[PDB]
Curated annotation (Swiss-Prot), chain B:
Membrane-crossing segments per the record: none
Protein name from the UniProt record: Inner capsid protein VP1
Compartments where found: Virion
Species for this entry: Bombyx mori cytoplasmic polyhedrosis virus
Parent-protein start and end of this portion: 1186 to 1235 of 1333
General function of this protein: Inner capsid protein that self-assembles to form an icosahedral capsid with a T=2 symmetry, which consists of 120 copies of VP2, with channels at each of its five-fold vertices. This capsid constitutes the innermost concentric layer of the viral mature particle.
Amino acid sequence: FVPDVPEGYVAVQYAHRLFSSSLANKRNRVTYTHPPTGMAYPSPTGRPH
Amino acid sequence: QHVDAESIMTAPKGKLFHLQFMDGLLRPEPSAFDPPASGEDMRLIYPLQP
Amino acid sequence: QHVDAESIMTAPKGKLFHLQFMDGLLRPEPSAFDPPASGEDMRLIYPLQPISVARSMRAIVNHNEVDRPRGAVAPSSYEMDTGTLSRNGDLLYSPVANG
């Protein structure tokens, strides 16, 4: 069994550049920046599929 | 102190839980060059009222 | 170490002073609610010329608010061009362009 990727998901090649240190609510969280939207996501929760 | 969701769910009515809450307004800001720490604080139980 | 202005002024020519300097780029920022301290750091002796002539790199740290810290210095490309050995035996940099 290989789970299919669900219809809404977006392909993203891993690259060191996608992850960074950043301030977020008095913490230096490992922010991830989505390559399409450009949006930064300090929490692992709430990230785009 | 901490309150298990298990006790919130299984205690008889009439029990008086004692929840604690942080006022994080005065929490220190991280140094600009300190590497990020892994992990994430989460809260499960919330007030319904002020 | 510290150097008195008195010694700067009274030493025979030929003496070799050893001045120290802070790179305060990585100095910690104060907490937002900490009360101010009294007193003021002062510097009296200064270089007449650039001092960090040996400096290949600087501030190898991430900054949370910004893409690169101000004053961060990358290594020059030349440190990293292995180049080639010429038939003479002289080392060469890689060609900038074909031909």
